[PDB]
Design a protein around this ligand. Structure first.
Ligand SMILES: NC(=O)c1ccc[n+]([C@@H]2O[C@H](COP(=O)([O-])OP(=O)(O)OC[C@H]3O[C@@H](n4cnc5c(N)ncnc54)[C@H](O)[C@@H]3O)[C@@H](O)[C@H]2O)c1
Ligand SMILES: NC(=O)c1ccc[n+]([C@@H]2O[C@H](COP(=O)([O-])OP(=O)(O)OC[C@H]3O[C@@H](n4cnc5c(N)ncnc54)[C@H](O)[C@@H]3O)[C@@H](O)[C@H]2O)c1
Lengths: 475, 475
């Protein structure tokens, strides 16, 4: 049987019922005990309403907005009898404002992104620095400094950000064993950072290759993806963004830093989904990824920062996304950027439309004595259908991470505002691994200088293959 | 009944029986009178041999090389009783050497590319300039200067290079007529160049969008295309190249000119099939094209050059390819450049494998009073199957162009070495148009500055939207 981890006696408030909400609700019903009538789904769309009604779940057809979120959500979060859980899987809503509302009213909180209120992403009066995920994350860090401790709110606990933070810790443990580095397993952030430094990890790619393909050819003027099209396009049009490692000797002319905050990131004055980087995964081998901004690019680099007494950073890894989405999404990007505007329509691939493929999602640690190491999941669509309904492999890696975060929050309900890097990674992977298919570690001798230089002059750094100067693709 | 244009009174030697040879053979058999035993195909491929046997045509399974071409081709082309025709549709053979051999022996000649002997494209001892199509074309121009007149040899007479030269002439005439400019169309090179100057044509894109889709999804580690994969990859890895207009006021730091030759071209120190440009076609609307090197980028800009009394160029249009290949080819390029090497296998889509689509191929004249004008063919796979066997829409545009050039060569057999810009464009389009489906001219308001600047700073020239500065896709 499937484990029922805990009883939830309070209200379960799910904000948003898109691809991730539809895959997460069945997991919540499977793994927690509660009266089904205590669950409530809020979503503005008719499509979501019909799906919730088909499940006999209470539904409120409203867009949560800055104007209504307090009057709308407080009664739902405080309905009792016990502590409620707010499961935020929406677009167009402020993660920070909803999280602070939940904590104000004693309700647990989890989300998979630091989302702003509608309008932020395309606000023409915002400076590029202000549109960065670094800046949005800094609003969460400030909230934590302002109100330490208290009710647990889990920020950015999906597949990536989320799970990959746990993969980094496991990968560091495996690397220490394989490199003969002795010592006890870290138990504090400082100890984790020092292990990464001692192992010589120069940087980390969130190295992903989605090979799911549809039973129909990509339609003209339709954006196709395996998860949120609105969310992927939004993050893809934000600046390319990365955690910036101490080993880097070069940044492009259009790179910029931040005057304040944790200090772990840079951004480029170009859209991340039109920025290519050289990377590698077990199934793809050498591939292009897109340098799409992601919270974990900053959070992981920040988490693994070592500082001296004066507080200056002496070690920090480079960390960023290196995303090869499904073929139809690759075509959708070429179409969107080539036309200069979003397609007229979009669709997310349903499991019934996917004929084969996997979502290979892992972390690539590089620069150490064994060059590069990839650790992560190779979950296939066939396995997904076997073990979880209403979602594809992309969705299941996300929904199962939300499940793990919820289990952790119930067992640690007064931990304050926390990121995935703050959770107990072993417990979270213990809950999530049944839904991840093959989880494997693979070494490779590939480097970004493989085969280079070619028949054209290239601006490369031959002294250190893994420099960003060698990873970034110029156009 | 199909028209029979001419009797060929000698041997027909077709070098190469790939996608284009297979599409051109039925048109030769359809439109020319000759004894069946006069035609012979030469190709080293076993796949090619079996198809030729099924077609009942003489086949010699041999690679033409520097070492054997004289011993092989001279007897075959001079078998008599009269003038033969060398129809060169191969890869890895020297167009120049074979052309000069055919001419030395009184045989007509046609090809669709200035191909070099095997080894040239990837010779590591060659500078990028020496690997350019500008340089290859200059060998043909020098051969013409050294031996003017003589037997007709048609260089680069496919769809593009080839047919698009005739489209440029027709487009110019249409542009003038659409402005109410009546009277004598030009008859000399200098008059054509002045028509383009007088109408204010700043530049020309060879603006192509292939929408042919396969009945099977893109296989991993397989390069898929609708015509020669080897030929497309070769030119895709040559330097980006363009005819360079007098109106341009900016070029990239890695752009280079030529010390010698006609003077009409620049090249970039980067591969063309990984260089993107902003362009437009009627069915695609705004799209990315790849800036792949092509003979006609130089020959058209050269043809349309106006010089002053001293001999200095005072007007010349920009001209280059803006190629959006079929979706599987787009994915194949992303795969190839992302891995840094050619896929292990490749395949060309057969008409039986194509579910739908067109090859939209035309010329986009811009900078004139009506901004932009696209003229060309919208041939669909469905129409192709009705009018010509053994090829897709891509192949038929090419094979019908070779048919037209062969007709022109037979009708003008003492014209010496000629390019597509040298032929009677009306007669050539008269022969080819039955195979081009819809041939239309479409005006558009679109410019490369549409929607720009976006939310990031960009280096653009707002006073002149069609400047290469605005067309080239840069970081
Ligand atoms: N961390 C990760 O790994 C990860 C992965 C995928 C998605 N995500 C994020 O999770 C979120 C959900 O993804 P998805 O795929 O389900 O998206 P989706 O687009 O499928 O669904 C979004 C849903 O939000 C609803 N919505 C829109 N405006 C709203 C409002 N004002 N209030 C409430 N609901 C509103 C829509 O009606 C829609 O059903 C997105 O923000 C996405 O960026 C994270
Ligand atoms: N101008 C245009 O519009 C245009 C369009 C398409 C192709 N082309 C060119 O036409 C040519 C043919 O294209 P394709 O699609 O048929 O290519 P293809 O790859 O299908 O076929 C090429 C053929 O050449 C043969 N070959 C290889 N080496 C040879 C040798 N030494 N001697 C004789 N034959 C040899 C191969 O066996 C093969 O059958 C290529 O050079 C291509 O670049 C021009």
């Amino acid at each position: 049987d499937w484990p029922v981890y805990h009883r939830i006696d309070g209200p379960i408030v799910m904000i948003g019922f898109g691809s991730i909400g539809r895959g997460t609700l069945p997991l919540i019903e499977r793994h927690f005990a509660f009266d089904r009538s205590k669950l409530v789904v809020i979503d503005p769309s008719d499509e979501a309403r019909k799906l919730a009604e088909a499940r006999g779940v209470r539904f409120i057809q409203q867009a949560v907005t800055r104007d209504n979120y307090r009057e709308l959500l407080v009664p739902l979060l405080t309905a009792g009898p016990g502590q409620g859980f707010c499961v935020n899987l929406s677009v167009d809503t402020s993660s920070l404002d909803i999280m602070e509302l939940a904590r104000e009213n004693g309700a647990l909180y989890i989300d998979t992104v630091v989302e702003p209120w509608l309008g932020f992403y395309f606000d023409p009066d915002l400076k590029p620095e202000a549109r960065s995920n670094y800046a949005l994350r800094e609003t969460v860090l400030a909230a934590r400094r302002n109100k330490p401790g208290g009710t647990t709110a889990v920020s950015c606990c999906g597949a990536n950000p989320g799970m990959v933070s746990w993969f980094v810790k496991q990968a560091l443990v495996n690397l220490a064993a394989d490199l003969g580095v002795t010592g006890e397993e870290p138990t504090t952030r400082e100890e984790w950072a020092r292990l990464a430094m001692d192992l010589g990890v120069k940087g980390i790619h969130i190295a992903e290759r989605d090979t799911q393909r549809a039973s129909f050819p990509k339609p003209f003027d339709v954006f196709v993806n395996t998860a949120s099209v609105e969310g992927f396009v939004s993050e893809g049009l934000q600046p390319a963004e990365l955690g910036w490692g101490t080993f880097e000797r070069w940044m492009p002319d259009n790179a910029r830093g931040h005057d304040s905050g944790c200090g772990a990131g840079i951004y480029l004055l170009q859209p991340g989904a039109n920025t290519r980087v050289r990377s590698w995964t077990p199934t793809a081998m050498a591939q292009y990824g897109f340098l799409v901004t992601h919270n974990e690019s900053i959070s992981i680099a920040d988490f693994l920062t070592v500082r001296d007494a004066a507080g200056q950073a002496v070690y920090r890894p480079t960390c960023h996304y290196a995303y090869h989405p499904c073929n139809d999404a690759v075509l959708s990007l070429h179409e969107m950027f080539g036309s200069g505007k979003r397609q007229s329509d979009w669709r997310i691939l349903d499991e019934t439309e996917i004929v084969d493929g996997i979502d290979e999602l892992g972390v690539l640690l590089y620069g150490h004595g064994k060059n590069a190491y990839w650790y992560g999941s190779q979950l296939s669509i066939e396995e997904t259908r076997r073990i979880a309904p209403d979602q594809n492999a992309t969705g299941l890696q996300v929904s199962s991470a939300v499940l793990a975060g919820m289990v952790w929050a119930l067992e640690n309900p007064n931990a304050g505002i926390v990121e995935a890097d703050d959770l107990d990674f072993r417990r979270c992977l213990e809950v999530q691994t049944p839904y991840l298919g093959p989880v494997v570690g693979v070494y490779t001798d590939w480097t970004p200088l493989a085969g280079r230089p070619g028949l054209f002059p290239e601006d490369i750094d031959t002294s250190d293959p893994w420099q960003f100067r060698n990873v970034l693709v110029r156009d």
